[PDB]
Symmetry: D2
Subunit: 124 residues, 4 copies
């Protein structure tokens, strides 16, 4: 992948969360997520995809991943998906928007989904 080397490794967001990812040559993302906030402790499995052959015109690299908030410690009956782009260079960044859906009854489904934005850096 063009940004395989650039994406693979440890990232930190503005909340102090830790995103540990391996980018496969084939577009795969695999790793672990540790949230600094919410109904979470320790690492959770993540999986996703990225564009392994991005535009060569200075565009970012599109990518996304999911965490289901179940591990050996806790179950928050919820999943977050991050959707965004990798921007390479001296201060490389992953700029995301995310959707967090909780399991709800049908009557409460209007209130099921939070939306926010996370920015990941290699330092922090």
């Amino acid at each position: 992948g063009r940004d395989e080397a650039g994406i693979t490794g440890t990232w930190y967001n503005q909340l102090g969360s830790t995103f540990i990812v391996t980018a496969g040559a084939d577009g795969a993302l695999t790793g672990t997520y540790e949230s600094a906030v919410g109904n979470a402790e320790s690492r959770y499995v993540l999986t996703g995809r990225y564009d392994s052959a991005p535009a060569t015109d200075g565009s970012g690299t599109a990518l996304g991943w999911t965490v289901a908030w179940k591990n050996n410690y806790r179950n928050a009956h919820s999943a977050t998906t991050w959707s965004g782009q990798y921007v390479g260079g001296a201060q490389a960044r992953i700029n995301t928007q995310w959707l967090l859906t909780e399991g709800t009854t049908e009557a409460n489904a209007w209130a099921s989904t939070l939306v926010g934005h996370d920015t990941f850096t290699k330092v922090k």
Copy 2:
């Protein structure tokens, strides 16, 4: 997984797209996505996660998945993440919201991300 059997198989959304998924006992989602609309043709790899031990109180099952819109035919330099819940029973449904990010330059990044909502059924 509680809904492993319920989730695994072929789903269709309101646009006529086809979502082919296997739910692993361990929370994994793997499969293929075929979009009826946009800069896409044929199937794309998807991966995600779901809550393999949901609440037993009538709540849905939280889940999410990603598609990077690169395959052997086309590259739309973009990724969609669906975040939502599986609702079991006679008319089982996956109710989602999604974020579609395109690779952009830094100057165009304000305009990088579409948001929408898809509902998947076993028929259609």
Copy 3:
């Protein structure tokens, strides 16, 4: 406005909420909103804007409005904005997506905003 007549009146969404709006020739939307769900009772003031000179090519009419969830009965310390399009004709519809932000502390601001989608019809 092209859709001034079409927009003005009483709308109902999929939750059974009631949206009472007047469209001004100048792009103004004014009226009241009554939610069937959440920390709400009776009517709340709404204001917004719409495109009073839409495309004549079969496109919908872009529009949006806000409700702050404070009235003489209750204060949910929150605001919803609906963003979407009016689609005219036999089964006229307002198709929206919405953002509901609650006042939070800085530490809880990651969890401040819900996202969803409402479809309004003239019947229901």
Copy 4:
């Protein structure tokens, strides 16, 4: 309103856009928006609402507003709604998420809505 004085005035976002607002004692927001990016020039009318009696516990003040992107110069057949909270003090901020819907045909409605996030400050 508790934050009437705090909200009223000129704000600037991270794109260099200018948001000129008056907060009414009654929860009204009125003013003008000038975008630094997109299919826009000069000022556009905005209207919205805010919580005129927020929590006294250090929570932000919920608020929202709409711009329809039609003025005497241009018509982008679109509307943006910002939903977020005012945070008072030395570096006062309005933290928002926004939905931008364009008028579309029914076949293109899946692609109608952008989502992003703007942070407004009194300086810039």
